[PDB]
Every structure is written in structure tokens, then in C-alpha cells.
């Protein structure tokens, strides 16, 4: 997943 808010990607 990527966070759709911060763009943080696992």
C-alpha cells in the first residue's frame, strides 16, 4: 500500500 494522504509507501 501507499498512503493516499502523505504518499508514504511500504
Amino acid at each position, epitope marked *: 500500500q501507499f498512503r493516499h494522504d502523505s504518499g508514504y*509507501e511500504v
Partner: antibody
Framework: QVQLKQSGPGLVQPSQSLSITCTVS????????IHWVRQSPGKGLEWLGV???????DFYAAFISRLSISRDISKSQVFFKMNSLQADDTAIYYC??????????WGQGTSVSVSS | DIQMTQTTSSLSASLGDRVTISCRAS??????LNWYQQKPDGTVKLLIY???RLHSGVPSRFSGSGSGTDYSLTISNLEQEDIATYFC?????????FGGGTKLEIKR
């Protein structure tokens, strides 16, 4: 109540730019991403880029030299600009809020026609 | 990019019918799959996120299922207000990508 309100033109001349402002309310730009998506007739939704919550942008590969996205946190505004529109850029353009998992609240859309 | 495919562009159904819309990803997306509804007036809403979670305010007649590469959105009993176009979107790997859409129409 979460709202995204778009402003910008219905008509762009070919080889001119498109500018759209997304004015948000009921949340802080510092907590959510603002994504830019378009829908062309006979095409689906296409993701163009985003202003992430932290203030950095990401652009889709096909738009890397044509897009500008910036924001004014105090005014709750995100600014979209796309350079040199052509016929295949006629579309409905949206801003949309990004939360943890998805684009959870959308702007009303800006119908952009490219024509001389 | 992860390519998203909605193999059916159009589906016909009667009010009250169970309606299922399919979506496939080109690789495993680990259940990070969202569904959007675009109404004829161009307004878009999130329906379902993370395969099966209902977005706030969305009727529980919408549900979602799947895993790996294959996902679906089901409307349990179809209503007039559901006549719209539905898009899936993978939330697994940047950049975000969408399916081609599935438009509903009324069968008569």
C-alpha cells in the same frame, strides 16, 4: 463537512495552459493529499498527480514536464497548472482528497474543452 | 504501472436485481482496491475502500469482495440512483491506476 470547490476555465485555446484552483474546507491541507484526476470521453479516470499532505508533489510520467502543483495552506488552496493543452486534453478535471486508503471526497469537476 | 481492467464496459439490469461489477489487477494488490461512482452529472463519490469497507454515508446495499488480483463490487438490490459509472482503483503501488469503468443501464 468536507468540501472541495474547483474554479477555473471551461475553454482553453490549443497550446495555452489550464489553471484550476481547488479550495477546501472542513479539513487542513497539512493532513490530507489533494489528487488531480481527469475523465475524457471514452476513456476512464486518469491520475495526473498529487500534492501530498507534507507539501511535496508527485506527477504521472506522461505529465512530468507539463504540470505544476502548489498550495497555499493559509487559504486552503491547491493550484493545478497544465501547460500547452491539445485536443486530447479535453476532459472533466477533478481535485480529490486523499485520506489513508483512497480518494474519499471529490471536487465537483471542471469541464475543460480545448478549441480555437 | 499496475494495469486495472474492467472487462465489461456496460451492464444492463432491472431495479431490484443483484449487480456485480468485476475488476482485475495485473499483479497482486493485497486488497488495496477502491471503488468510485461517477453519476451522469459528473459528480464522483468513493463507495468502497480496502476491498470491502464502506465509505461514510454509502448505503450498505454496496459491498465488495476479492483478493490477490481479482475484485468485485456488488449492489445487492439495484436502485435508480445507482445508475452511474463505476471505476476500480488500486491503492497498492504508486502511481494510482484506475479501471476503464462499467456503466449501468436499465434492462427492459
Amino acid at each position: 463537512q468536507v468540501q472541495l470547490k474547483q474554479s477555473g476555465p471551461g475553454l482553453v485555446q490549443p497550446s495555452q495552459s489550464l489553471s484550476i484552483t481547488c479550495t477546501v474546507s472542513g479539513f487542513s491541507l497539512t493532513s490530507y493529499g489533494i489528487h488531480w484526476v481527469r475523465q475524457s470521453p471514452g476513456k476512464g479516470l486518469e491520475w495526473l498527480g498529487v500534492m501530498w499532505s507534507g507539501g511535496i508533489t508527485d506527477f504521472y510520467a506522461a505529465f512530468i514536464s507539463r504540470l505544476s502543483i502548489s498550495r497555499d495552506i493559509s487559504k486552503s488552496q491547491v493550484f493545478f497548472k497544465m501547460n500547452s493543452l491539445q485536443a486530447d486534453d479535453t476532459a472533466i478535471y477533478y481535485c480529490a482528497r486523499g485520506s489513508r486508503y483512497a480518494l474519499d471526497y471529490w471536487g465537483q469537476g471542471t469541464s475543460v474543452s480545448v478549441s480555437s | 504501472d499496475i494495469q486495472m481492467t474492467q472487462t465489461t464496459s456496460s451492464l444492463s439490469a432491472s431495479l431490484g436485481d443483484r449487480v456485480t461489477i468485476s475488476c482485475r489487477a495485473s499483479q497482486d494488490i493485497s486488497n488495496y482496491l477502491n471503488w468510485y461512482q461517477q453519476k451522469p452529472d459528473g459528480t464522483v463519490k468513493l463507495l468502497i475502500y480496502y476491498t470491502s469497507r464502506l465509505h461514510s454515508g454509502v448505503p450498505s446495499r454496496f459491498s465488495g469482495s476479492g483478493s490477490g488480483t481479482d475484485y468485485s463490487l456488488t449492489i445487492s438490490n439495484l436502485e435508480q440512483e445507482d445508475i452511474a459509472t463505476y471505476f476500480c482503483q488500486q491503492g497498492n503501488t504508486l502511481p494510482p491506476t484506475f479501471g476503464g469503468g462499467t456503466k449501468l443501464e436499465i434492462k427492459r
